[PDB]
Short mmCIF file of C-alpha atoms in Angstrom, two decimals:
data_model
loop_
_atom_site.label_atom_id
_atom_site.label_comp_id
_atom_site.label_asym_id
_atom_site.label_seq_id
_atom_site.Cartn_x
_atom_site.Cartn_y
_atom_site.Cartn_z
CA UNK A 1 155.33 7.78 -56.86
CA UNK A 2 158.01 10.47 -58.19
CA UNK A 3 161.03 9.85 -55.68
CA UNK A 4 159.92 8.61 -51.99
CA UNK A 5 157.83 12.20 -50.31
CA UNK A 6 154.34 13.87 -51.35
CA UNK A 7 154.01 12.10 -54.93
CA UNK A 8 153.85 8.60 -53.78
#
């Protein structure tokens, strides 16, 4: 996770 795009 890191927001709600790529990172999660």
């Amino acid at each position: 996770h890191g927001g709600g795009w790529g990172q999660p």
